[PDB]
Amino acid sequence: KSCWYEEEIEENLRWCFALNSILHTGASQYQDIALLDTKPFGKALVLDGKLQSAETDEFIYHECLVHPALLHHPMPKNVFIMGGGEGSTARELLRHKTIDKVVMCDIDEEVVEFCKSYLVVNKEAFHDSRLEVVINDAKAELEGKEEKYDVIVGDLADPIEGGPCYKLYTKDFYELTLKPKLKKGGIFVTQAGPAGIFSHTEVFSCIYNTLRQVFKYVVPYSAHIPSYADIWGWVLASDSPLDLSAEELDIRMRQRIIEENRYLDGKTFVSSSTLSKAVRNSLNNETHVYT
Amino acid sequence: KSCWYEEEIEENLRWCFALNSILHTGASQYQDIALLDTKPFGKALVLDGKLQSAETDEFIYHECLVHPALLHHPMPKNVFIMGGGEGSTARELLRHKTIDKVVMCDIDEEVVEFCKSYLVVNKEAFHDSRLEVVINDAKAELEGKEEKYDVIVGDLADPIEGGPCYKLYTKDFYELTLKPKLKKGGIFVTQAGPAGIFSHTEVFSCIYNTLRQVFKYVVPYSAHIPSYADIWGWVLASDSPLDLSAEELDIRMRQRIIEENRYLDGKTFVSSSTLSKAVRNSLNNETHVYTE
Amino acid sequence: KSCWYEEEIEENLRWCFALNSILHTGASQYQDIALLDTKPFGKALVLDGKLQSAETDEFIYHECLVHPALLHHPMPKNVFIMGGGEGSTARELLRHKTIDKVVMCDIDEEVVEFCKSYLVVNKEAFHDSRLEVVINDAKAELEGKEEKYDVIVGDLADPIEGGPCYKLYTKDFYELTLKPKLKKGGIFVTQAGPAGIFSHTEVFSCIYNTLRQVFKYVVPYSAHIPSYADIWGWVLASDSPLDLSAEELDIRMRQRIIEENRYLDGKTFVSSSTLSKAVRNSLNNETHVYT
Amino acid sequence: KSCWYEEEIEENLRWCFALNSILHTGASQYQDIALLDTKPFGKALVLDGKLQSAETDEFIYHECLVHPALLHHPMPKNVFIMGGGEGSTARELLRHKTIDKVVMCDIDEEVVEFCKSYLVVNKEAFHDSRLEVVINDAKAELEGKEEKYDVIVGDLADPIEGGPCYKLYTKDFYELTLKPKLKKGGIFVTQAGPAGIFSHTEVFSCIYNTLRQVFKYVVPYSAHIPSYADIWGWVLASDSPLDLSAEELDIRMRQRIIEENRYLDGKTFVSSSTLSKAVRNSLNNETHVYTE
Numbered sequence A, C: 001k002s003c004w005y006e007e008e009i010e011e012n013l014r015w016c017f018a019l020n021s022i023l024h025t026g027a028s029q030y031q032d033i034a035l036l037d038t039k040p041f042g043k044a045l046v047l048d049g050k051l052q053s054a055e056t057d058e059f060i061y062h063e064c065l066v067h068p069a070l071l072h073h074p075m076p077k078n079v080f081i082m083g084g085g086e087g088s089t090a091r092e093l094l095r096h097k098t099i100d101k102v103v104m105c106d107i108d109e110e111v112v113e114f115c116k117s118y119l120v121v122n123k124e125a126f127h128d129s130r131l132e133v134v135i136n137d138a139k140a141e142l143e144g145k146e147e148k149y150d151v152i153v154g155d156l157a158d159p160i161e162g163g164p165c166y167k168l169y170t171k172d173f174y175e176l177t178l179k180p181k182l183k184k185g186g187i188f189v190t191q192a193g194p195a196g197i198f199s200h201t202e203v204f205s206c207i208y209n210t211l212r213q214v215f216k217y218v219v220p221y222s223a224h225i226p227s228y229a230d231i232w233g234w235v236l237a238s239d240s241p242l243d244l245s246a247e248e249l250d251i252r253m254r255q256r257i258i259e260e261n262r263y264l265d266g267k268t269f270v271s272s273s274t275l276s277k278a279v280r281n282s283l284n285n286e287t288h289v290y291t
Numbered sequence B, D: 001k002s003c004w005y006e007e008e009i010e011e012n013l014r015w016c017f018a019l020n021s022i023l024h025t026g027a028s029q030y031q032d033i034a035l036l037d038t039k040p041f042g043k044a045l046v047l048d049g050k051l052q053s054a055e056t057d058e059f060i061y062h063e064c065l066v067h068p069a070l071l072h073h074p075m076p077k078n079v080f081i082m083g084g085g086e087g088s089t090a091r092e093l094l095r096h097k098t099i100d101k102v103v104m105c106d107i108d109e110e111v112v113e114f115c116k117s118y119l120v121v122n123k124e125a126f127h128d129s130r131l132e133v134v135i136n137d138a139k140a141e142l143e144g145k146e147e148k149y150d151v152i153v154g155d156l157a158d159p160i161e162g163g164p165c166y167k168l169y170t171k172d173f174y175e176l177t178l179k180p181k182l183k184k185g186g187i188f189v190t191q192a193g194p195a196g197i198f199s200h201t202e203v204f205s206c207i208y209n210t211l212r213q214v215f216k217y218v219v220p221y222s223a224h225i226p227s228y229a230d231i232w233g234w235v236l237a238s239d240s241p242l243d244l245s246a247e248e249l250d251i252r253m254r255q256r257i258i259e260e261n262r263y264l265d266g267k268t269f270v271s272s273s274t275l276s277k278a279v280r281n282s283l284n285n286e287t288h289v290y291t292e
C-alpha cells in the first residue's frame, strides 16, 4: 500500500495503481517518458503523465487495433502505421503471413528508442526485416511518398487532447490525403478513444461520423482494456464491404496469423462490433464532423 | 477539486470520484451505509465502503440483472428477489406488465428503509401494491414456504467463504433449496461479480461452474459499468432453453415492458452473452464449485 | 476510509484528512469557502482549497497569536486586527479584562458572515459590544483614520502567496503606516507563516528580518499546530523591551485574562520563543527585507 | 507529479511525499524494508510501510535521541543500544570522544545489513572499531551478561500490547533487567513516540509515567521532525540528577563531541524539555504503567 501512480483520467475521476518501482525514465523534446513497474498491470509506459499501455493488457488493445482490418482484407501485403512507437502495433501486424512491409511513422524518435530498449515483448518485431521506422509527422510522410498501402492503421493520440494529432482525424485529411494512399480494396482502421456508455461522445462518436462522410463502409467496435479504466474504441473503414462471419474470421486467423491470438477470435470480434443500444443510437445521431 | 471518495477496487488499485457532498452516513450491525453526491456519477450508495449503485449508471446493472431473465420466460408472474434492498431491482421487475407479485427478501431492514426514503428513483416501486418486502435470510424464507416462483433473482454481495451470502451460491443451495421453488419454465438469474478479462476468475467463473452442475442451460453474460471500473457479470440458469434471438427479445420488450429500456435491446443482450475468447475458455475449464 | 480532503501543502507534499461531511459551502467574489467536518481535526474552514483553521487546534494558533503581545503590554485597551475574519482572534483578545475596543478589519465580508453563522465557538465574541467589524483593506483603513492602538495584530495570509497581503509585510508599510498608528509603548504582533526547521526560510525569516529593520525589539516564536502539518510562527515587535519571565507571564494571565488558557502558560511562551539552533542561526543570517 | 509515497499516520490522516524512485524493496520475517528516493525528504527508509528515517531530517531524531543523555553523563564510555539497526544512533554516539564501546543490539539482521550497505551516511560508523553489532533480543542480551553501561539507548518501535518490543517498555523490564545493567551515574534514554498536543497520549505519557515508577529523575522532551508530521518525544531517566543549563551543555558539546551538531545546542535542549501547559499536565496526571 505504500507507493502509487495516480492519473486523473478525467477532471473528476482518478485512477491509481500501486507501484513496485520506477524502472526507467527519459524525455524527448516532445514529452516526459516513464516505465513504471505496477502491481496491478505490470510494466506501464507513461507519456507526460498519461498511461499509454500496460504489460498485462496491451495485447487486447493491439490485437483489436490490428487484426480485424487485416483479416477483412483478401491479401494485405503492406501497411502504414500513423504513430505506434511502442513496437506493439508493428508486432501484431508482423504476425500476419501475407505482410511483407510495415512502416511505423511516429514523430518522437526517443520514445521509439526507449521502447526498443525497454519493451522486451517487441524485440523480435523491432528486428524484423519487414519493418521500417520513419521519424516524421504522418501527414507529411503520407503526402511526400507515392507508395500506396493495403491497410493504414491510425495509432495516434486522441484528437481533442491537443493539436498535432487532431489534423489526422479530419474529413479533409481522410478524403484528400489518406484515401489516395490506400490501394484499391484498402482498409483503414483507427483507434477512436474511449467508447464507454457516456465517454464515447468525447471523440469515438465524432471519429465514427467523420469516417462515415468519407468511406462507403464503416464498422465501429470496442473492447474493455482494464488498465485504461474504460471501454476503448476503434473504427474500420473501407470502400469495400466489411462483412465476415465469426467462422470465416476464425478460419482466416488460422490460415494467416502466426501462433494463437490471446484475446480475439471471430465471436469476440462479432461481440466487439455489436455496440449497446445507447451507443448505437448516439453514433446514429452524431452530427459533429472534424472539419 | 479537494474532496474525493476513494475505493480500493483491489488492494493495489484505487478508483476515486470527486465529491460534492456526503448526503448521509450511518450503520446497522451488518454494515455501514453512506449516500454520496459525486461529481462523475451522481448520487452513490456505498455499503461498508463498497460502492453499490451510482445514479448515472445503475440502470445498466439493474436492466442487465432483470430483463434477460424475464424476457426469456414465456409469462413471468411471480418473482422472488434474494437481497436487492435498494429498490432498483424491484423497480425494473415492476416495469413488466406480466408481473403480479414481487417479493424482496433482504436481511438488512435498515438498508431497505434507507433506500425507500433516499432513493427517490424507486419511490413508485416501493409503493407498488405488487411488492412485498420480507426481512429474512433468503434460504430460510424460501425453505419455510411452499410458494414457487417464475423467476428468482440473486442480488446479493459476491460470495466470500465465511460471509452470510456465501451459502446462497452453493451447489446444494441451488439444488435442494432454490430449484424446488422454481415453477415449470422457471429461470434463475444472479449477479456474478466482476467479469473482466482477468477479474472474472475471482467469482464469475465459479458461479458459472456451480450453476452448470445444477441446471441444464446456463448463460453467462456481462457488461461494463463505468462506476464499477470493470465489466460486471450475471448468469442465467434454467432447465428450459434460453435461446432467443435479438429480434424476439425486442418484440418481447415492446410487448411486455413499460417504457423503453435505456441500456438493453436484443442486440445488446446477444453481445453481452458472447464472452471473449479467453473468458469463454476460462469458464469452460473452471472446476471450482461452491459447496454446502 | 472512504472520503478525503486533500491539500498540497507544498508542491511535493500532500496532507489528507478523512471526512465526515461537507457542512457548508459559500463563495465571495474573492474566494471559495467551505466548512468540512473532518475526522482528525473536527470542523475545518477551507478558503480556496487551503485550510485556515481546524476546530481541534485553532486555540493553539489564536492563543499564540494574541496573548503574548497583550501580556507584554502594561495596559492594552484598544487593538486593531489586520485580517482575522473567523472571529477567533477577536475572541481571544476579548478575554482580556483591560480591552475596551477591538477592530477586525478584513476585506471579505462573506467570509466574516460565513464564520459568524457557522463558527459556533465565536458567537459570544461576534456579539461583544467592544468589537467593531470593518470591511476594508487594512492598509487603507489604518491610513484613513487617526485612532492609534495599543496593540496591532497581523492575522493576514502569508506574504509570498499572492499580492494583496504582501504589501502588509513590507519595511515601508511597517515604518510609515503601521508605527504611526501604534501608541507610545505599543506592541505589534504578526503571524509569520511556517516556522519548521526548513520551512521557516520561505517567509518567517524574512518577516523577522524585515521587522528588525523597523522596531527596536523583535521576538520570534513558534509552536506546532497539528492540522497545519508544521510548526507555525509569529513575531512580536515593539520599541519597548519584550522581556517577562514565565512567572510574571503567569501572574499576568491570572490577573488579566478571563478563564484559563488551554495552550499557553508562561513556561510555554518561554519555550516557544526559544528557537532551535538552526532556526536561530538562519534568522541571524537572513538578509532579505520585504521592500 | 504522478508518483507518491503514502503513509497513514492515523487511520484518518494521510501524509504523502512525491517520489523520484523506489531504490529497493524487500523483507525479513519480521518486516518489509524499502528505501525510497522522495522529493521533499530525500532518501527514506520505510519498515512495514512506516517511515523510519528520512535523509533530510533524521539528524534531528538521532541528535535528540543521543546527545542529551551522553552530555548529562560525567564521562560516558560504554553504551548499549536496544534496536537502532540503521546505524544513525551509533553514528551520533561515536561522535563522542569519551566513548570506547558501543553495542548495537537489534533483532533483525536483515535491517542492519541493508542499512550497512545502503545508508552511506553511516558507513564510517559501521566500520568504527568501537562498534559491536549483536543480533538478539535486547532483554535476553542484557540479562545474559553482567556487563554494565554508562548509557543505554532505547531505539525501538513504539510499544504495542502484544508486539515484540513491548516488553522493553515495562516497569519490570526497567527495574529488574535494565537498571541492574546501568553503571553508577548511568542514564537511560528511550524514544517515546509521538509527542503532539493530542498525539502524546498514545505512548509518550505512558512511557514517561512508567519510567517515573522506576527512576528518580525523569526528563521528557520533544522536537518536531518534519518527515514524521508530528512532534516526536524522548525520555531521559537516571538515579542521578539531570539538570544542566544550556551553557553547560554547550561547553560539554564543544569539549566532547566531534564537529558541530546540526540541530541541538543547549538552548534547544532546554526548549525541548519545557513541554507545553497541556502536555505537562497530561504527563503529570498519567496513571498508565506498562506491565510485565
Ligand SMILES: NCCCCNCCCNCCCN
Pocket: A009, A050, A051, A052, A083, A084, A085, A106, A155, A156, A157, A158, A191, A227, A228, A229
Ligand atoms: N490512461 C487512459 C487510457 C488512455 C489509452 N490511450 C490509448 C490510445 C493509444 N495511442 C497511442 C499513441 C502512440 N503514438
Ligand SMILES: NCCCCNCCCNCCCN
Pocket: B009, B050, B051, B052, B083, B084, B085, B155, B156, B157, B158, B191, B227, B228
Ligand atoms: N467493487 C466495486 C463495484 C461493486 C459493485 N457491486 C455490484 C453487485 C451489487 N450487489 C449488492 C446487492 C445488495 N446487497
Ligand SMILES: NCCCCNCCCNCCCN
Pocket: C009, C050, C051, C052, C083, C084, C085, C106, C155, C156, C157, C158, C191, C227, C228, C229
Ligand atoms: N494548511 C497549511 C496551514 C496554513 C495555516 N495558515 C495560518 C495563517 C492564518 N491566517 C488567516 C488569515 C485570515 N485573514
Ligand SMILES: NCCCCNCCCNCCCN
Pocket: D009, D050, D051, D052, D083, D084, D085, D155, D156, D157, D158, D191, D227, D228
Ligand atoms: N509514524 C511516522 C513516523 C514514525 C517514526 N518513528 C520514529 C521511531 C523510530 N524507531 C524505530 C527503531 C528501529 N526499529
Ligand SMILES: [Cl-]
Pocket: A081, A083, A084, A085, A086, A087, A088, A089, A090, A091, A104
Ligand atoms: Cl508500433
Ligand SMILES: [Cl-]
Pocket: B081, B083, B084, B085, B086, B087, B088, B089, B090, B091, B104
Ligand atoms: Cl430491489
Ligand SMILES: [Cl-]
Pocket: C081, C083, C084, C085, C086, C087, C088, C089, C090, C091, C104
Ligand atoms: Cl477575528
Ligand SMILES: [Cl-]
Pocket: D081, D083, D084, D085, D086, D087, D088, D089, D090, D091, D104
Ligand atoms: Cl544504530
